[PDB]
mmCIF file of C-alpha atoms in Angstrom:
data_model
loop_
_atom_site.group_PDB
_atom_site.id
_atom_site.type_symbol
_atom_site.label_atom_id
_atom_site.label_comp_id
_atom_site.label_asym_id
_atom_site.label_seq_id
_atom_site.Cartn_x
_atom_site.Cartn_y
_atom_site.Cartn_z
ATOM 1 C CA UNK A 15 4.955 -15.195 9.461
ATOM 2 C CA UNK A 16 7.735 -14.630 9.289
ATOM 3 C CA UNK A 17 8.403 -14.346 5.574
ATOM 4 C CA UNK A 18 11.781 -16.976 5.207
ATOM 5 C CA UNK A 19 13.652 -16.270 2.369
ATOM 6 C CA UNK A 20 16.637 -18.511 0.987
ATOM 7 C CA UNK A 21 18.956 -16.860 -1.227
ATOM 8 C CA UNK A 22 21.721 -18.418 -3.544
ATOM 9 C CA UNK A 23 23.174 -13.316 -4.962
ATOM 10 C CA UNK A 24 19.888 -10.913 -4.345
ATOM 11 C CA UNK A 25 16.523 -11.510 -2.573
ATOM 12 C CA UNK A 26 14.515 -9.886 -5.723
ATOM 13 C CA UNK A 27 12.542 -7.130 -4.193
ATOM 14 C CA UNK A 28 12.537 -3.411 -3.317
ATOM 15 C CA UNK A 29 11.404 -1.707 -0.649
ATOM 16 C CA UNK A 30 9.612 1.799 -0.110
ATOM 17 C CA UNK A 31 8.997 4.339 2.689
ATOM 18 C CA UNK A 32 5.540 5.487 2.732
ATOM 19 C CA UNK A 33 3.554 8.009 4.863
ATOM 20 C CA UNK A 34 -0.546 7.131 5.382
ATOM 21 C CA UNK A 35 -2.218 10.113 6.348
ATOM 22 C CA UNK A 36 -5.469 9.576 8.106
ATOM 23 C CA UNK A 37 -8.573 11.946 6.392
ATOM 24 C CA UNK A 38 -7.743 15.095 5.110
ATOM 25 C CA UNK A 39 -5.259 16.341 7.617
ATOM 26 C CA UNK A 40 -1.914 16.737 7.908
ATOM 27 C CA UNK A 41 -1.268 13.757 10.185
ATOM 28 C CA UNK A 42 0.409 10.537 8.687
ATOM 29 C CA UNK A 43 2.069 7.421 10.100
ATOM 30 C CA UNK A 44 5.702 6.029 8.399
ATOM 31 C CA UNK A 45 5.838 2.401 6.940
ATOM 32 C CA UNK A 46 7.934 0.681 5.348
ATOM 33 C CA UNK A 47 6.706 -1.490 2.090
ATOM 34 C CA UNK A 48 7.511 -3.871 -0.433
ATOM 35 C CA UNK A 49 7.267 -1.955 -3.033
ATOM 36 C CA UNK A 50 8.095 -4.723 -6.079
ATOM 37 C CA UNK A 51 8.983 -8.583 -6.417
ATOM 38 C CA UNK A 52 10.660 -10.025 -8.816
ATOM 39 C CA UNK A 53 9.230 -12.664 -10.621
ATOM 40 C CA UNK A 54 11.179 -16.423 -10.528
ATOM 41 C CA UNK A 55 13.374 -14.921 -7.622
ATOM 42 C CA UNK A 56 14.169 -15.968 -4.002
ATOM 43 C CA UNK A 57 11.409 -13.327 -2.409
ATOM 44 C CA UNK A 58 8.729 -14.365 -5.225
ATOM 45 C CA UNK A 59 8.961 -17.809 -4.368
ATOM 46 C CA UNK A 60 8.851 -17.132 -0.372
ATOM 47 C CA UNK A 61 6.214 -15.928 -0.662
ATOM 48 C CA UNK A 62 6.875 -12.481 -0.376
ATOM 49 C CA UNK A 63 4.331 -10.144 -1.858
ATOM 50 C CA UNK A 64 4.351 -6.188 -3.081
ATOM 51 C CA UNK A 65 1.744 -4.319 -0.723
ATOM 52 C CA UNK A 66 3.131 -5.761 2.293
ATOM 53 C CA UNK A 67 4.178 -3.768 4.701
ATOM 54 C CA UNK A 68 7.630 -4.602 6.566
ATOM 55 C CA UNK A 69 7.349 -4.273 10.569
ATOM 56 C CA UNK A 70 10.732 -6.574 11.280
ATOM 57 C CA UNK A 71 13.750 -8.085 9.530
ATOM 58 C CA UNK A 72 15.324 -11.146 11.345
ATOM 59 C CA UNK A 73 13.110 -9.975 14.885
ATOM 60 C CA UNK A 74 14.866 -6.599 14.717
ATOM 61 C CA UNK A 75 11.726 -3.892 14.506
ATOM 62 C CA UNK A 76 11.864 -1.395 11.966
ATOM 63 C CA UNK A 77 9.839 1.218 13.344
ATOM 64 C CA UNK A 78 11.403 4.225 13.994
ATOM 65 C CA UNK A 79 14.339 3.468 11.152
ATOM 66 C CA UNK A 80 14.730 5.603 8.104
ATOM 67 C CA UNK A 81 14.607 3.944 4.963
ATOM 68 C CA UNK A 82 18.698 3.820 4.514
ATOM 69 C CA UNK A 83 18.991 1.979 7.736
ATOM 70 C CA UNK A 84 16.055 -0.861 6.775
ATOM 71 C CA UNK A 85 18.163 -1.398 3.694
ATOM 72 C CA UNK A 86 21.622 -1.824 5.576
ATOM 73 C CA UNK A 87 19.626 -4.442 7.762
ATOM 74 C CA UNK A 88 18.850 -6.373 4.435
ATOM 75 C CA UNK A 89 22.327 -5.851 2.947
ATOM 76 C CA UNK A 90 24.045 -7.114 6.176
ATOM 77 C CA UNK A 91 21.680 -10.230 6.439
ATOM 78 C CA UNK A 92 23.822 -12.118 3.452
ATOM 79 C CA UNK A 93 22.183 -15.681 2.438
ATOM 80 C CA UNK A 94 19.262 -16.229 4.270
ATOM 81 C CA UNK A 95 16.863 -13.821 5.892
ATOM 82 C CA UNK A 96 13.072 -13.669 7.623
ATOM 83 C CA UNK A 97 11.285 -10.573 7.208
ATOM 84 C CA UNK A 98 8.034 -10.225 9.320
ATOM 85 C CA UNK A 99 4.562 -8.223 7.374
ATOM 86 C CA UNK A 100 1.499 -7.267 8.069
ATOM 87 C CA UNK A 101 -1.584 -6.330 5.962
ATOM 88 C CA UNK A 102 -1.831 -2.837 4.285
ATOM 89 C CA UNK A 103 -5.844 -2.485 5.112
ATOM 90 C CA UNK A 104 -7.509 -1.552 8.068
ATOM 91 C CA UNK A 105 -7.332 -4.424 10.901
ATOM 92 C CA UNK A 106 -8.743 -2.776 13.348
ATOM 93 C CA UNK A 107 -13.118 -3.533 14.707
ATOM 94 C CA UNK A 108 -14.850 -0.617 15.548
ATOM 95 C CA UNK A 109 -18.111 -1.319 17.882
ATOM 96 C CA UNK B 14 -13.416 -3.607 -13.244
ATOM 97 C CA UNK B 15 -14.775 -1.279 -12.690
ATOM 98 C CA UNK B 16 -16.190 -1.748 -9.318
ATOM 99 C CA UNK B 17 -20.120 -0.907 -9.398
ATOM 100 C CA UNK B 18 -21.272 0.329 -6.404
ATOM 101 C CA UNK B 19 -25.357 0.631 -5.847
ATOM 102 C CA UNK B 20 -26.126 2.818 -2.850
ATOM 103 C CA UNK B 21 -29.307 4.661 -1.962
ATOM 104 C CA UNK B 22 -26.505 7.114 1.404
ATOM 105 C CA UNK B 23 -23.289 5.900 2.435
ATOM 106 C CA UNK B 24 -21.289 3.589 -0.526
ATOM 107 C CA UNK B 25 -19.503 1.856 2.756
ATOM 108 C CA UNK B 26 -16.107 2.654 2.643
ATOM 109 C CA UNK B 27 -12.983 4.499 4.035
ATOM 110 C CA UNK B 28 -10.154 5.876 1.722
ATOM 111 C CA UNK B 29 -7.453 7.342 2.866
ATOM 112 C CA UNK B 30 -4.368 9.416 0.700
ATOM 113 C CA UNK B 31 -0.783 7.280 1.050
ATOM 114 C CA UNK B 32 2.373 9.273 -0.090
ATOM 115 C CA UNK B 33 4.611 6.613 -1.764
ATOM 116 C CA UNK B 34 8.515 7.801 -1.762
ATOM 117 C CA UNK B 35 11.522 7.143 -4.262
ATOM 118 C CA UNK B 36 14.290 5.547 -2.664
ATOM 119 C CA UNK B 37 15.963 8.053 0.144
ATOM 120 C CA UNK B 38 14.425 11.249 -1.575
ATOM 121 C CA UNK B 39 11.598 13.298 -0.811
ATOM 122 C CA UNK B 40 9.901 13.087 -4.047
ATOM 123 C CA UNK B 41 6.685 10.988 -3.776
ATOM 124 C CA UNK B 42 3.726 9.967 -5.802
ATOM 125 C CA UNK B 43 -0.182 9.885 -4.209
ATOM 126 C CA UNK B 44 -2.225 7.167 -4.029
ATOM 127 C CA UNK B 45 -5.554 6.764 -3.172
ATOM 128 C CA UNK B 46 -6.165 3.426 -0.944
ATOM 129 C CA UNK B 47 -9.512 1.568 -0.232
ATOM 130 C CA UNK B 48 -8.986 1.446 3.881
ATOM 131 C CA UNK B 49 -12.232 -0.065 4.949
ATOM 132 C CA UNK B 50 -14.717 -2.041 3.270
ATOM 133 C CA UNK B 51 -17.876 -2.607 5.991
ATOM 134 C CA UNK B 52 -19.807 -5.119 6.006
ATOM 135 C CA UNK B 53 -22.864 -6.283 4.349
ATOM 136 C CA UNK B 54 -22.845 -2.436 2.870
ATOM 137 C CA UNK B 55 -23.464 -1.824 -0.486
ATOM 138 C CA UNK B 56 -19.451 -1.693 -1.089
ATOM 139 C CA UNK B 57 -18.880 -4.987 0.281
ATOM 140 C CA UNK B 58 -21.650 -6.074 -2.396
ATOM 141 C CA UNK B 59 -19.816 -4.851 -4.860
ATOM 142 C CA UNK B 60 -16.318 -6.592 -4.327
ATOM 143 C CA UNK B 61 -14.644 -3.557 -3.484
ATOM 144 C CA UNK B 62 -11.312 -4.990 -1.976
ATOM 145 C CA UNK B 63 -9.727 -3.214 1.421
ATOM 146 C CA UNK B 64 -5.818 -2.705 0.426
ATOM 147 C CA UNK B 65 -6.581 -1.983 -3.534
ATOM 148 C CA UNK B 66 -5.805 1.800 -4.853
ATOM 149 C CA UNK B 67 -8.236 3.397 -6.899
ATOM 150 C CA UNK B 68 -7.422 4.477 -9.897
ATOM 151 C CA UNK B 69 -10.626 5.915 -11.383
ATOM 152 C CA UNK B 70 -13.733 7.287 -10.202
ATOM 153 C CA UNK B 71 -16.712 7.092 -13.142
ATOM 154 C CA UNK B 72 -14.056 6.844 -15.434
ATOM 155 C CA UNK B 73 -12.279 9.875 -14.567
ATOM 156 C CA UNK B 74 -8.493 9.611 -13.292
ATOM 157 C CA UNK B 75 -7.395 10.353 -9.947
ATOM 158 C CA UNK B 76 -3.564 11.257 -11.093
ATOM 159 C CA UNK B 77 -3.003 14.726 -9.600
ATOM 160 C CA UNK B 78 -6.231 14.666 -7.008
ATOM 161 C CA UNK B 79 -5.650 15.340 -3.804
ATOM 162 C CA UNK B 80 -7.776 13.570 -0.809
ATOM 163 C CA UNK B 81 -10.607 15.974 -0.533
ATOM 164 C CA UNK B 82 -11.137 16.196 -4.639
ATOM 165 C CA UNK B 83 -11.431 12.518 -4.339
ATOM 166 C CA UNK B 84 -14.155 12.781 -1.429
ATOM 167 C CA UNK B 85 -15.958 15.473 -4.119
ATOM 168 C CA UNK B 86 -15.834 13.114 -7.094
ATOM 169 C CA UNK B 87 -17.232 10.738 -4.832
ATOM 170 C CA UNK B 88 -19.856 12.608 -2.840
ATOM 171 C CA UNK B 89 -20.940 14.370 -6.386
ATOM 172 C CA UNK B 90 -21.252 10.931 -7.758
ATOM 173 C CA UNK B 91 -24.985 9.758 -7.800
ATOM 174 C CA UNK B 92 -26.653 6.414 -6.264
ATOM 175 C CA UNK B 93 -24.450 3.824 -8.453
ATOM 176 C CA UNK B 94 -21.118 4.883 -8.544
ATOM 177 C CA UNK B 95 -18.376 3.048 -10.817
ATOM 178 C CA UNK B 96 -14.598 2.443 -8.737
ATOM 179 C CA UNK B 97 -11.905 1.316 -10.953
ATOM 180 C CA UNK B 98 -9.180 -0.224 -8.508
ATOM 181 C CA UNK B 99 -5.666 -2.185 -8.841
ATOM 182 C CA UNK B 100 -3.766 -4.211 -6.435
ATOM 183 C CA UNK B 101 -0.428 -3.227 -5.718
ATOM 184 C CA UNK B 102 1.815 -4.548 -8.775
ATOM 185 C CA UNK B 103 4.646 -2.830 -9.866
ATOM 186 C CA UNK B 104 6.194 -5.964 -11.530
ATOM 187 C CA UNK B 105 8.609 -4.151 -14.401
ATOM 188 C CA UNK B 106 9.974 -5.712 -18.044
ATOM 189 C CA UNK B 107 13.042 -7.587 -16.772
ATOM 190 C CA UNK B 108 14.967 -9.270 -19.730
#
């Protein structure tokens, strides 16, 4: 962490906006995820891996930003960029 | 695969219902994640992996389910109960 990838064109991956609701109620939390990576591309060989959810791109957070505006901050990032995950699992110890 | 589970009452793990969204739209498909795995439970035996989405339940699909007909195939489910799971992998036919 951060995820550094070095691109020639593309990074080779998609991203998704996801809601996690917690039990069966109406409550639910907004991620961001990497939804696919291409195989043989920039993001496959960084290490990148679909499941993981996106919390920054270059430092910037992306909490709080729709998915239109996560995308512009990968557009605008041109050759190289870092993109900071975190597992998709509970992380969390309960006592 | 499948995932066999031997309990006695409690498997030993969470699920909880993730909404997965195309692109900028509001159409979505459900998944069904493994949360939680504890601990030396009968789960965690098993191999049942935290992050993974299940896919069946005894061989019966979850397409369509919502969370709380997951919880009933589940809870009607008797003392070994089979979990058929996949990682995230939406890798696609790129030529």
């Amino acid at each position: 962490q951060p995820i550094v990838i070095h691109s020639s064109k593309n990074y080779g991956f998609t991203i998704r906006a996801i809601r996690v609701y917690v039990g069966d109620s109406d409550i639910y939390t907004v991620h961001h995820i990497v939804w696919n990576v291409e195989e043989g591309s920039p993001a496959c060989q960084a290490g990148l891996k679909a499941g993981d959810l996106i919390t920054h791109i270059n430092g910037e957070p992306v909490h709080g930003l729709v998915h239109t505006e996560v995308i512009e901050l990968l557009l605008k990032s041109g050759n190289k960029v870092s993109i900071t995950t975190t597992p998709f699992e509970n992380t969390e110890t309960s006592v």
